[PDB]
């Protein structure tokens, strides 16, 4: 798809069921050591699920923050069709994702039996007998992400960065994240967008903030 087609697909997903936003500390590391190996596989014997990455769920009307401690990252806007490994509101091989937040759950219930189980390998039955509240559980499909985030979205309440483990493929990359308050973010995004276009993936710049997304000309 061309740039306009990606932009349209991005906004369509953002305005309906949402999608993912992955900030990156090192755009060259992400391009050279994650995107390019994914692409080589896709154009070779086929795409594979070698590389898993952290990203935040974004969606129109959901005032969600992204992970950027120094307000200086660029990043990738990634399709909701990316393969999902696990999602939580609190914050790699599939199977490593915790079913629930042990320390969070303990500080909610003060049920010391929480410490008798392994939170990466506990049955939904066990978790019910333990009394683990739903806000401390992870979810593992996209519809459950939407449901988990529906109450803050409809409330218009600000929330912290959420974490999905995803495995994106090159076709899933729909946009380049730009922090409009950061010179560094815009400098890095510029370079990253140029490198991806040169590979055949021409992406729009996207200002995301506070449940709203906007296309940018150049940064």
């Amino acid at each position: 798809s061309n740039r306009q087609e990606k932009l349209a697909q991005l906004m369509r997903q953002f305005e309906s069921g949402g999608l993912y936003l992955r900030t990156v500390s090192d755009h060259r590391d992400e391009f050279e050591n994650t995107f390019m190996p994914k692409l080589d596989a896709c154009l070779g014997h086929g795409c594979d699920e070698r590389y898993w990455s952290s990203a935040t769920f974004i969606q129109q009307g959901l005032n969600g923050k992204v992970h950027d401690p120094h307000a200086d990252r660029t990043g990738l806007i990634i399709s909701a069709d990316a393969r999902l490994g696990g999602f939580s509101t609190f914050d790699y091989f599939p199977g490593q994702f915790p079913k629930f937040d042990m320390m969070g759950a303990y500080q909610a219930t003060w049920n010391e039996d929480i410490f008798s189980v392994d939170a990466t390998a506990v049955s939904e039955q066990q978790m019910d007998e333990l009394g683990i509240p739903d806000e401390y559980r992870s979810v593992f499909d996209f519809d459950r992400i939407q449901e988990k985030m529906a109450q803050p979205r409809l409330a218009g309440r600000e929330v912290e960065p959420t974490e999905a483990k995803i495995c994106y493929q090159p076709k899933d990359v729909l946009g380049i994240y730009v922090d409009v308050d950061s010179p560094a973010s815009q400098s890095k995004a510029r370079e990253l967008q140029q490198a991806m276009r040169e590979q055949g993936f021409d992406l729009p710049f996207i200002a995301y903030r506070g449940g709203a997304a906007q296309e940018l000309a150049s940064v």
Binding site: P98, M102, M103, Q107, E112, F115, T120
Partner: protein, 74 residues
Amino acid sequence: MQIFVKTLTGKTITLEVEPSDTIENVKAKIQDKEGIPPDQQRLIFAGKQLEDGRTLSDYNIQKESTLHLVLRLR
């Protein structure tokens, strides 16, 4: 190597340790800084409670990992 320990009041403790250290030795080291006997300690990592008798390597606990200290009775 250096690992960290967080309390349920938010305190961060630092610990010099080696991967062959048993969980017993890690707790002895917390005892020296916090005065908590090891039998009153739970150490949590990656959603699991660590077992005395096993080591840091048995849990693949690597440098700069953060543990979570919870007090218990015995």
